[PDB]
Design a binder for this molecule. Sequence first.
Ligand SMILES: CC(=O)N[C@H]1[C@@H](Oc2ccc([N+](=O)[O-])cc2)O[C@H](CO)[C@H](O)[C@@H]1O[C@@H]1O[C@H](CO)[C@H](O)[C@H](O)[C@H]1O
Ligand SMILES: CC(=O)N[C@H]1[C@@H](Oc2ccc([N+](=O)[O-])cc2)O[C@H](CO)[C@H](O)[C@@H]1O[C@@H]1O[C@H](CO)[C@H](O)[C@H](O)[C@H]1O
Lengths: 159, 159
Amino acid sequence: MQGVNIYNISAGTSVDLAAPVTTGDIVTFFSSALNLNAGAGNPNNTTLNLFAENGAYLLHIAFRLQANVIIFNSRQPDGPWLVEQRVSDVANQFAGIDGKAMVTVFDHGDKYQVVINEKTVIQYTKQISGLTSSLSYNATEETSIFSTVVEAVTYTGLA
Amino acid sequence: MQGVNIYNISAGTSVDLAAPVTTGDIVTFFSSALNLNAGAGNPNNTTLNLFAENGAYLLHIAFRLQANVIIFNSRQPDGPWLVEQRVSDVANQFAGIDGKAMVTVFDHGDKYQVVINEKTVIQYTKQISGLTSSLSYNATEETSIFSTVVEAVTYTGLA
Ligand SMILES: CC(=O)N[C@H]1[C@@H](Oc2ccc([N+](=O)[O-])cc2)O[C@H](CO)[C@H](O)[C@@H]1O[C@@H]1O[C@H](CO)[C@H](O)[C@H](O)[C@H]1O
Ligand SMILES: CC(=O)N[C@H]1[C@@H](Oc2ccc([N+](=O)[O-])cc2)O[C@H](CO)[C@H](O)[C@@H]1O[C@@H]1O[C@H](CO)[C@H](O)[C@H](O)[C@H]1O
């Protein structure tokens, strides 16, 4: 049966999913703020991650204000960062909506479709495969482009 | 061709969907407040609706604090309200989450699965079929159990 799960992630923390995200499933991160004027990242201002049970970074989404870019990557638990995919113009992706933001990830099996608010920003071909069993939102209060608390909603059992 | 559409509905208004909601699709209403101490409804404190192209209420979700019940019903544009399905203990459905809430609707074709937060409250057998062309959130800035503006998110092209 289709299901909805809600998690509240504090900047810099992770949450274990009660229902893993697999092929055909959906995950959306919700921010109750949009701070496109925050200081520079070191180098990241904000990141959202989809973890496998073994700790692999299935999907790493990093937002860099000063570099004006959004990075999409993956990584094994004890391996090096893999091939980065970049998308310039950070502010442009959040256009049309101020004060809050949304990042959605459709798990399509061979790829992760990433949507910023209503705009699909990338069709990310997976570098690592696996069920998403954990999620994290990493940032500080000072330089995150999102609210200190980011709400994550998963839609599972869809296929 | 999955897609995400975002709408911000002010209490008492309707919004037209850019991408219709049909079998296999999902729509979630997000409230940035939870007012279980609001004045009595008249009889509704808050209603969320899915409308067909012809104005028919495909799904009418009515929250009644005083009556301590949630109504699920349908009706043709110029027809009478049909057979109500009801669920008691309103506050109980929102248990565990204070200050906000969400109501998700899964269009399963023959039924609408309504989920408040993570809790499935009803498997509503459709009284009227068709694609959802519009949505609405009806209430007053004084007795709604939700925030004045409710955000509606649709995930379409999932089937
Ligand atoms: C500080 C900074 O901008 N780091 C970038 C930079 O890091 C490197 C690393 C190695 C070399 N090199 O051997 O020539 C050059 C630059 O570029 C990297 C990509 O080439 C990364 O963008 C790195 O930042 C790291 O990115 C990963 C994701 O790929 C992750 O976000 C890390 O937290 C981040 O430090
Ligand atoms: C004020 C109130 O509690 N209205 C209820 C009530 O209305 C009726 C109507 C007819 C009869 N009757 O012929 O014996 C009794 C009560 O009960 C109705 C269901 O029987 C409705 O619940 C009505 O509220 C209306 O419900 C519809 C959805 O079904 C919609 O929410 C309307 O806005 C609401 O007024």
